[PDB]
Amino acid sequence: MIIIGGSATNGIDESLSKILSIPLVKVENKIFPDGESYIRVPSSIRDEEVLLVQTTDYPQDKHLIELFLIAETIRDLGAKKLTAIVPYLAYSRQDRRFKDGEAISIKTILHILSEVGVNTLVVVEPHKPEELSYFKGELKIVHPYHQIARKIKEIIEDPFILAPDRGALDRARKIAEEINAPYSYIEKERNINLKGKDVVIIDDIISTGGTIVQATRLAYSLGAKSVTAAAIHLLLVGGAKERLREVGVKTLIGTNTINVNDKDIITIDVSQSIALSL
Amino acid sequence: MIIIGGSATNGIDESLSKILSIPLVKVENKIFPDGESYIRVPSSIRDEEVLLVQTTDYPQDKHLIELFLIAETIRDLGAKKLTAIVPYLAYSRQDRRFKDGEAISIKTILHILSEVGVNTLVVVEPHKPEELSYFKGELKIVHPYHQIARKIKEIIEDPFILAPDRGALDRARKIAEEINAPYSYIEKERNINLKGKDVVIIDDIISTGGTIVQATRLAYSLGAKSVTAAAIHLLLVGGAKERLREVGVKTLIGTNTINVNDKDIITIDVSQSIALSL
Ligand SMILES: Nc1ncnc2c1ncn2[C@@H]1O[C@H](COP(=O)(O)O)[C@@H](O)[C@H]1O
Ligand SMILES: Nc1ncnc2c1ncn2[C@@H]1O[C@H](COP(=O)(O)O)[C@@H](O)[C@H]1O
């Protein structure tokens, strides 16, 4: 077994190397003046079992195409098994045809990964885990809930765990139950004793921050002592970070499935969670 | 039969509609705040034969992923046959493994297009036509030589046609012979009566413009009255346009397999050449 780090690992390839004590081989990668990607897999692999680490955060399209290229190269170079660890899988929000003739993006991406030679696919908090049925090989989903629980407990004195919609309830519950905290969810259509408590709003993804902002209102208008926001994938887009500080979200918790900053942001390294699931 | 225009047609979908008198359906496409692509195929297609127009010029990776998404959607929507007209095919320069463990990018791209549902692939001046053997369906290569010949004859009084390397010779010969002009090629290693003639340097692609600049020297140092440069794919990168004016390339001739400008650049619409080859 060896670990091959793609063009987009967020330290995950290196820390997985320590944790598992497996040798680490880094993919050579540059950008032509064209704009196109150069990809070279710099070792022998002849009969090795490979753990490819390639996340597909921004830029999603280039990182995806780089993933495709690296993957075929690896299968071409003799590898015995390809395991693709893609922390943030792109085009996940596109689950189905919301209107007729819309593309089911995640289907295409997944089909493409079977072709191209990926045997086992490992993903952290897929937006909706049924999605991954499209992938023909073996699936290993990673829910880094314990690591998020542990962090919340360190940072938050008297936590109430609030999920922004029914979608996020299962995740809130499993996180809150491990830390024996109270939990609830906001009910779109037309517990609650979060009065005076330190609320933590947890979602899988935070892009614009719209759902989290609407949720931060209800919280304060219900006696929230403070509001903290947490997601596995922090794809903060344009306003986001500021749009949240303005509504009074003090702290931001995310993980390294994505690339980020540090005025804040509390970044959990989810390699430990990924290692278990291997 | 119908024509579906992707997110990147350069008028080619529209003019192919006139030329062939086939109805034109445009793909709905936007960019999420994410960065990700939205793709919707807005008509019925149930049993239609489709002509998809998607070029893959910059940004190559997004356009490729958009191509993949649109393609599967079309096959999913019932279409009887998918013909993908991709004027400029990206990752063409990556023909083979120039070093061990390099990716054969074009192989991956092509394999991906077979999977995904493309039956027939139509390409204009592929960098090297053996490349396309990797594609499993039917191939239609388009060499728009007659349209380039016609244009040269309109604009250039007393043309000499110069190919920058032996690679570009076949193309120079076929273009020059149709216009009964003299032709030659520059010989790397360590006719020629272009003395006093209006030289036209023809290549498949112009990126940085390096090969064209070295060739413009020999020309002037051999009595060239003037130098014009022509390529099918004008991917002018950074300096390029200026780097050429400086060495005295007066005129630039390209085609609409790519998107461009017009201080210059003489742009041939190669839809007519694509139509023949259908
Ligand atoms: N990358 C993206 N960014 C923003 N919205 C998206 C994205 N992908 C899909 N959507 C839309 O989000 C809606 C689903 O909501 P949700 O998946 O809960 O955010 C669908 O109507 C999609 O069209
Ligand atoms: N998009 C690109 N831009 C610039 N050079 C490239 C590109 N793709 C491949 N190459 C390199 O160009 C060399 C082949 O030369 P040519 O194909 O004649 O330009 C190979 O060694 C490739 O590594």
Does residue A115 have its Cβ closer than 6 Å to ligand 2? no
Phi, then psi, of B229 in degrees rounded to 5:
-115, 140
First to last CA, chain B: 12
Query: What letter would DSSP give residue A221?
Result: T
Residues in the annotated binding site of A for D-ribose 5-phosphate: 190, 203, 207-211
Using CB atoms, pick whichever of A111, A208, A237 lies closest to residue B115: A111
Q: Does A29 touch chain B (CB under 8 A)?
A: no
Buried/exposed A175-192: b ≥16 CB within 10 Å, e otherwise: bbeebebbbbbbeeeeee
Alpha carbon distance A172, A160 (integer Å): 10
Beta strand pairing call for B28-31 and B37-40? antiparallel
Helix, strand, coil percentages (3-state) for chain A, rounded to 5, are: 30, 25, 40
Which pair of tokens denotes residue A48? 């090795």
Which residue's entry shows tokens 């029914």? A166
- Whether the CB-CB separation of A94 and A103 falls below 8 Å is answered with yes
Residue A22, Cα to own-chain centre: how many angstroms?
23
Which residue's entry shows tokens 């809130």? A172
What residues have CB less than 8 Å from A192, skipping those under 6 apart?
A184, A222
Verify whether residue A62 is a known catalytic residue: no
Does residue B99 have its Cβ closer than 6 Å to ligand 2? no
Alpha carbon distance A46, A51 (integer Å): 14
Contact B65 A69 (CB under 8 A): no
**What is the residue-wise DSSP string for A48-63?**
-EEEEE----SSHHHH
Which pair of tokens denotes residue B154? 């309109």
Residue closest via CA to ligand 2's atom 13 equals B93
Question: What is the edge-to-edge ordering of all strands in the sheet holding B138-142?
Answer: B24-26, B2-5, B49-53, B81-86, B120-124, B138-142
Q: Does B237 touch chain A (CB under 8 A)?
A: yes
Which pair of tokens denotes residue B11? 């008028």
What residue ranges define each of the domains in chain A, with the CATH number in brackets?
Answer: 1-143+270-278 (3.40.50.2020), 144-269 (3.40.50.2020)
Alpha carbon distance B125, B120 (integer Å): 16
Alpha carbon distance A74, A80 (integer Å): 9
Deposited resolution, Å: 2.8
Using CB atoms, pick whichever of A36, A115, A116 lies closest to residue B91: A36
Which residue's entry shows tokens 């949720």? A215
Q: How determined?
A: X-ray
Which pair of tokens denotes residue B4? 């579906």
Point out which residues pair with B203 in neighbouring strands. Answer: B231
- Whether the CB-CB separation of B112 and A116 falls below 8 Å is answered with yes
- H or E element, residue A258: none
Query: What letter would DSSP give residue B71?
Result: H
**Helices assigned H by DSSP within chain A:** 12-20, 60-76, 105-114, 145-155, 169-178, 210-220, 240-246, 271-276
Alpha carbon distance A227, A229 (integer Å): 7
Contact A103 B72 (CB under 8 A): yes
Which chain A residue has the Cα nearest residue B99? A40
Radius of gyration (Cα) for chain A, nearest Å? Answer: 20
Which pair of tokens denotes residue B221? 């140092």
Using CB atoms, pick whichever of A61, A94, A235 lies closest to residue B61: A61
Buried/exposed B13-47: b ≥16 CB within 10 Å, e otherwise: bbbbbeebeeebbbbebeeeebbbbbbbbeeebee
Which pair of tokens denotes residue A213? 């902002």
- Whether the CB-CB separation of B229 and B249 falls below 8 Å is answered with yes
Which residues in chain A have their CB less than 8 angstroms from residue B94's CB? Answer: 36
Q: Does B54 touch chain A (CB under 8 A)?
A: no
Contact A60 B34 (CB under 8 A): yes
Alpha carbon distance B259, B238 (integer Å): 15
Question: Coil, helix or strand for B226?
Answer: strand
Query: What letter would DSSP give residue A248?
Result: T
A23: cis peptide before it, omega within 30°?
Answer: no
To the nearest whole Å, the CA of B112 is away from the closest chain A CA by: 7
Contact B58 A116 (CB under 8 A): no
Alpha carbon distance A206, A229 (integer Å): 9
Which residue's entry shows tokens 């938050």? A156
Point out which residues pair with B40 in neighbouring strands. Answer: A102, B28
CA angle, corner B155, sides to B154 and B157, nearest 5?
95
Contact A39 B69 (CB under 8 A): no
- Whether the CB-CB separation of B142 and B124 falls below 8 Å is answered with yes
Helix, strand, coil percentages (3-state) for chain B, rounded to 5, are: 30, 25, 40
Alpha carbon distance B237, A110 (integer Å): 33
Of A157, A156, A159, A135, the C-alpha closest to A86 is A135
Q: Does A105 touch chain B (CB under 8 A)?
A: yes
Which pair of tokens denotes residue A263? 């005025």
- Whether the CB-CB separation of A205 and A235 falls below 8 Å is answered with yes
- Whether the CB-CB separation of A169 and A185 falls below 8 Å is answered with yes
Of B166, B209, B206, the C-alpha closest to B188 is B166
What residues have CB less than 8 Å from B278, skipping those under 6 apart?
B20, B51, B83, B122, B140
Q: Does A93 touch chain B (CB under 8 A)?
A: yes
Alpha carbon distance B177, B15 (integer Å): 28
Alpha carbon distance A264, B50 (integer Å): 51
Which residues of B belong to the active site? 188
Query: What letter would DSSP give residue A134?
Result: G
